[PDB]
């Protein structure tokens, strides 16, 4: 009956009403205090449908301990809705609630790192760096001394972190990016190379070494790094697209097109390579390359983003708006699908359409977009809000 | 070696004589296809001469004409349509590939023309001491008319298969996809071609140390498959 009530509540909240869903949630959770998923469904429902966030998360912090997802949902809700200076206190009661040091500690450093006075956010992480954390903790520690200014100690923390945790590749990514923001740059080559000889099946670290050896000159060595990447994994779209973009960023458009053909040979149902292949064709031939892309990988967000960018590129705004709506509704978690969407709606549309496209992005906050994670990993644009991030990607196109 | 033997042959053996030595032979039919309109025309003209020669044999008078097609009349025609369906089952009863014509046609399907050179797979498996999988290997090598050996050793046991290419493709479909092995995996070590076939038939030779397995291969003039599979096995084990 509890599964039946959750299913009927999901159907009722999807189809018609919300207050009947509130009543069936109050009933189904007054039947028993339950697992983390049912309180989680009530909290997610109210996060879709402000004061009841405090009410339901207060009942969750009362009757459901050890459901830390409800704790972090509560702490974020008291951050955004009311304001900061008590939610940390509430997270302090999570300090009183859970000595398991996995997720609450970097949540706490998220809290005191959004604001001023980050030296407290030093010492707490110090506690965390001896508490009981997967050196995931360490990468936040490595972000700690990276966002203010990198000390030689900022090089020290990632080196000690890798001396603990050689296997984790995002630490190698942080060491390489930190050495990129140092003065010279083959130390970053040494960092990326040691990471890629130790991690070794992590595609963004290969992309980082590729973009580094493309940027400093000797593009041939960047092509060799990417071709070692395409062999050592193999058969993935993320390295094939970087090889295609490496030939297209140089003057070799023909070789970029034949590497795109070799890429779509061995991984046809992939969104990013088809979204690049639509762009690589000459402009009278994109119309059917995109149709073949829709037939190979339908319901893929990168592909519908490419079709929307096509219709905007052919200046048909009435179809491009519909295709952008379909793009963001197949997957709203992709960041570039909002980047082009706000840039299009500021190029064409009324002011309330720009209102729309910044409603629905902050509704479901994105990830995974290479322009979006290109500015979400810019540490100059790291701890800032998401409308600012969407404006920054929309200005850089 | 004091001087290599061509240098000892000349030290004088030269003059203005270029030569044409002992040419050796290197160690055809085309099928006819028809368009569908030509299939219809050929079928209809073969059938027109068939109807013409059946009516011809009626015209000579060897036999009365064939069968043309309330309980009594269609009881007659029920016996005659039983005769007709029985004659259809007679013409299917002869021309049937009785019991061993299927066997010789399955053989001439599976036994290719290996002279013109024999395609050789070499596989290594980490472990095939499983009885069912060594049975699948032995039985499918014998049944696809593939020759070879499975020498057995710890961590690298070598399956040299040697037959026609249509059997080699079926054996690599078996060995790499159909036999579900599992840390124990099978790889394709080599897939080449040699002049003619070396081994006798698929016989599971075995020695637990490497030197006698290389000696058993060297009996056949095929030690290079062993040295290759052993060396890439120990190189995978180090890497």
């Amino acid at each position: 009956r509890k599964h039946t009530w959750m299913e009927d509540a999901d159907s009722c909240v999807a189809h018609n009403a919300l207050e009947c869903a509130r009543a069936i949630y109050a009933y189904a959770l007054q039947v028993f205090p339950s697992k983390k998923s049912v309180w989680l469904r009530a909290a997610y429902f109210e996060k879709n449908h402000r004061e009841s966030l405090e009410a339901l998360l207060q009942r969750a912090v009362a009757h459901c301990p050890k459901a830390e997802v409800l704790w972090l949902m509560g702490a974020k809700s008291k951050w955004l809705a009311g304001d900061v200076p008590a939610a940390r206190s509430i997270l302090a009661l999570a300090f009183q609630a859970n000595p398991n040091s996995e997720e609450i500690w970097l949540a706490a450093v998220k809290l005191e790192s959004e604001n001023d006075e980050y030296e407290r956010a030093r010492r707490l992480l110090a506690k965390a760096r001896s508490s009981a954390p997967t050196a995931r903790v360490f990468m936040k520690s490595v972000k700690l001394e990276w966002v203010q200014d990198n000390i030689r100690a900022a090089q020290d923390l990632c080196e000690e972190a890798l001396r603990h945790y050689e296997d984790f590749p995002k630490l190698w990514m942080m060491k390489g990016q930190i050495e990129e923001q140092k003065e010279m740059m083959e130390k970053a080559r040494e960092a990326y190379n040691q990471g890629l000889k130790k991690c070794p099946h992590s595609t963004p670290l290969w992309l980082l070494l590729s973009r580094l050896e493309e940027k400093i000159g000797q593009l041939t060595r960047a092509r060799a790094i990417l071709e070692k990447s395409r062999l050592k994994n193999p058969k993935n779209p993320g390295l094939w697209l970087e090889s295609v973009r490496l030939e297209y960023r140089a003057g070799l458009k023909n070789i970029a097109n034949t590497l795109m053909a070799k890429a779509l040979q061995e991984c046809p149902n992939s969104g990013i390579l088809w979204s690049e292949a639509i762009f690589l064709e000459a402009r009278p031939q994109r119309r059917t390359k995109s149709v073949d892309a829709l037939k190979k990988c339908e319901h893929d967000p990168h592909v519908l983003l490419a079709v929307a960018k096509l219709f905007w590129s052919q200046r048909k705004i009435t179809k491009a708006r519909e295709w952008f709506h379909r793009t963001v509704k197949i997957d709203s978690d992709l960041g570039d699908a909002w980047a082009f969407f706000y840039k299009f709606e500021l190029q064409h549309g009324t002011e309330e359409q720009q209102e729309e496209v910044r409603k629905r992005c902050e509704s479901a906050e994105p990830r995974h977009g290479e322009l979006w994670c290109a500015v979400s990993k810019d540490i100059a644009n790291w701890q800032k809000k998401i409308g600012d991030i969407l404006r920054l990607v929309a200005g850089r196109i | 070696p004091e001087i290599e033997w061509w240098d000892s042959y000349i030290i004088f053996g030269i003059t203005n004589l270029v030569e044409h030595p002992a040419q050796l032979n290197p160690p055809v039919t085309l099928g006819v296809y028809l368009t569908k309109k030509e299939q219809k025309k050929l079928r209809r003209q073969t059938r027109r001469e068939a109807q013409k020669e059946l009516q011809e044999k009626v015209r000579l008078g060897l036999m009365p004409p064939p069968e043309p097609k309330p309980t009594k009349v269609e009881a007659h025609v029920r016996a005659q349509m039983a005769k007709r369906q029985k004659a259809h089952e007679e013409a299917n009863a002869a021309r049937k590939l009785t019991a061993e014509q299927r066997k010789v046609k399955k053989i001439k399907k599976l036994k290719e023309d290996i002279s013109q050179g024999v395609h050789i797979s070499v596989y290594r498996v980490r472990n095939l001491s499983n009885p069912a999988k060594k049975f699948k290997i032995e039985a499918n090598a014998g049944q696809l008319y593939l020759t070879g050996v499975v020498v057995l050793h710890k961590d690298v046991n070598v399956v040299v298969v040697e037959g026609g290419p249509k059997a080699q493709k079926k054996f690599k479909r078996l060995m790499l996809h159909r036999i579900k092995w599992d840390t124990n995996k099978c790889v394709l070590v080599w897939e080449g071609t040699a002049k003619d076939r070396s081994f006798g038939e698929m016989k599971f030779k075995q020695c637990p140390t490497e030197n006698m397995a290389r000696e058993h291969f060297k009996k056949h003039g095929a030690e290079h498959y062993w040295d290759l599979a052993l060396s890439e096995s120990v190189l995978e084990s180090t890497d």
């Binding site: 097109n257 053909a261 031939q285 | 055809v28 085309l30 099928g31 296809y33 569908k36 030509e38 290419p165």
Partner: protein, 123 residues
């Protein structure tokens, strides 16, 4: 023959090639014609291209090797267009055929073997 027709399939390979092209005509995997082979090379749905060395002039299909190097598709020249045309189930000479990819069709093993064999011919 024409020296620019390269690679050229010998008699055993062209017998296998014309039987595979005939089977692809039966399985509806075959696109006859140099324009249809150009189309299925551009759409990237072509398994492999056969061509005819006795096409006069040859250059009306010699763009197809270049397309087969920009799409990573195996290409091979049959000896004469009449045999290739009959191998497509048409009485007219056909100078360029595209055996194309289909959804898991039963010729994929024969097509893969012929692909591996005619990428050995260009040497």
């Amino acid at each position: 023959v024409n020296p620019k027709a390269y690679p050229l399939a010998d008699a055993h390979l062209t017998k296998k090639l014309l039987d595979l092209v005939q089977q692809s005509c039966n399985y509806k995997q075959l696109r006859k014609g140099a324009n249809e082979a150009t189309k299925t090379l551009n759409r990237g749905i072509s398994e492999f291209i056969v061509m005819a060395a006795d096409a006069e002039p040859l250059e009306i299909i010699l763009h197809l090797p270049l397309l087969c190097e920009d799409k990573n598709v195996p290409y091979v020249f049959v000896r004469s267009k009449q045999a290739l045309g009959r191998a497509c189930g048409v009485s007219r000479p056909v100078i360029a055929c595209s055996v194309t990819i289909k959804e898991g069709s039963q010729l994929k093993q024969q097509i893969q073997s012929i692909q591996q064999s005619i990428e050995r011919l260009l040497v």
